[PDB]
Amino acid sequence: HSKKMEEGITVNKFKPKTPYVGRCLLNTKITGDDAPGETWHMVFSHEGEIPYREGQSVGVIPDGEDKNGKPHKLRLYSIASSALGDFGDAKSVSLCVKRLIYTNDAGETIKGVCSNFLCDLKPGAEVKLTGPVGKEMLMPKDPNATIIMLGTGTGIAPFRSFLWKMFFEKHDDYKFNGLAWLFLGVPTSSSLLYKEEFEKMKEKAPDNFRLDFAVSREQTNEKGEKMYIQTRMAQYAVELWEMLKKDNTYFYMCGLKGMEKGIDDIMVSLAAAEGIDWIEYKRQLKKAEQWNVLVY
Numbered sequence: 091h092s093k094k095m096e097e098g099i100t101v102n103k104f105k106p107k108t109p110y111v112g113r114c115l116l117n118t119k120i121t122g123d124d125a126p127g128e129t130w131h132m133v134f135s136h137e138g139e140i141p142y143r144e145g146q147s148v149g150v151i152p153d154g155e156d157k158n159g160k161p162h163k164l165r166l167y168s169i170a171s172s173a174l175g176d177f178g179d180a181k182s183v184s185l186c187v188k189r190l191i192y193t194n195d196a197g198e199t200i201k202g203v204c205s206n207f208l209c210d211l212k213p214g215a216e217v218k219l220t221g222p223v224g225k226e227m228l229m230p231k232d233p234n235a236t237i238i239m240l241g242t243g244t245g246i247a248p249f250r251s252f253l254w255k256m257f258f259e260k261h262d263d264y265k266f267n268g269l270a271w272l273f274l275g276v277p278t279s280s281s282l283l284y285k286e287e288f289e290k291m292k293e294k295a296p297d298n299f300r301l302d303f304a305v306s307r308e309q310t311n312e313k314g315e316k317m318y319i320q321t322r323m324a325q326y327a328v329e330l331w332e333m334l335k336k337d338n339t340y341f342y343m344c345g346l347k348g349m350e351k352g353i354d355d356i357m358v359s360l361a362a363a364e365g366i367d368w369i370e371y372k373r374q375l376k377k378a379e380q381w382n383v384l385v386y
């Protein structure tokens with residue numbers, strides 16, 4: 091029995107040995123020039139060949155060979171579009187990709203293989219895809235569920251997928267009527283991803299959608315602390331902790347590995363304050379499919 095929309099999902103229809111070859115339709119930079127690092131939203135054509143569901147990922151095999159002449163390893167990317175897609179016809183898939191650039195030991199600049207291949211794609215270019223992959227980030231079956239979403243950076247991807255389904259589409263068998271609450275933590279205002287879309291959703295379903303942004307380098311709390319995602323969340327601690335006590339509440343976290351630790355630190359304290367061991371409570375929540383995490 092599952093609390094998530096797991097029935098009839100498709101997994102690994104396309105594999106690394108036999109990828110699906112799609113084509114780039116659009117590739118747009120969605121962060122301002124201010125932003126530390128660039129993030130691109132790209133859409134690929136798949137002609138209905140990849141039957142994915144909100145919350146899943148696709149693997150991308152970047153062009154070229156590794157230092158051993160073999161083809162590159164695949165890299166996974168959460169799908170940023172709902173099942174119907176940005177165009178509403180179930181024939182395209184969209185990704186949210188941050189261009190990775192770092193420096194090695196010798197002080198030389200190294201560009202990440204797959205992220206740079208992807209952000210450099212031009213409309214018409216082909217791309218090898220695999221998947222769909224995953225069950226961890228699927229949506230709850232319950233249309234009246236309280237869904238709390240916490241993402242950092244590109245971790246916004248699966249939540250854009252969820253929200254398009256919930257607020258931008260009409261479905262024969264699904265009408266969301268619960269409360270969705272999104273918290274998005276980014277470094278700069280120029281790094282807010284998809285804010286415009288979220289703002290329109292908010293106007294559309296003001297009683298079903300709550301929205302909170304945490305711009306670390308630009309906002310501080312009373313003590314004067316940087317506005318990290320948990321720093322903005324602690325401001326609603328009593329409310330969220332009370333929400334976690336209910337059976338119809340589902341927590342999803344996605345983004346940079348770091349975030350996991352800082353939320354756990356806030357939680358351990360709220361729980362102990364009520365005589366609860368967070369480590370055991372979290373375990374029970376994970377078992378009940380109420381605590382869902384995907385960090386990388």
Ligand SMILES: Cc1cc2nc3c(=O)[nH]c(=O)nc-3n(C[C@H](O)[C@H](O)[C@H](O)COP(=O)(O)OP(=O)(O)OC[C@H]3O[C@@H](n4cnc5c(N)ncnc54)[C@H](O)[C@@H]3O)c2cc1C
Nearest residue numbers: 165166167168186187188190192202203204205244247386
């Ligand atoms: C399930 C899942 C979902 C994901 N979803 C997304 C998504 O939606 N968007 C997205 O952008 N990414 C996502 N990723 C990350 C993505 O898979 C790639 O890892 C990422 O894009 C970088 O890969 P690359 O091929 O560009 O880099 P690679 O060429 O593989 O380089 C990565 C290597 O760079 C090194 N490195 C990185 N930073 C530094 C540093 N500061 N100093 C030194 N070494 C460093 C690390 O050793 C790492 O092994 C996801 C990953 C997973 C597992």
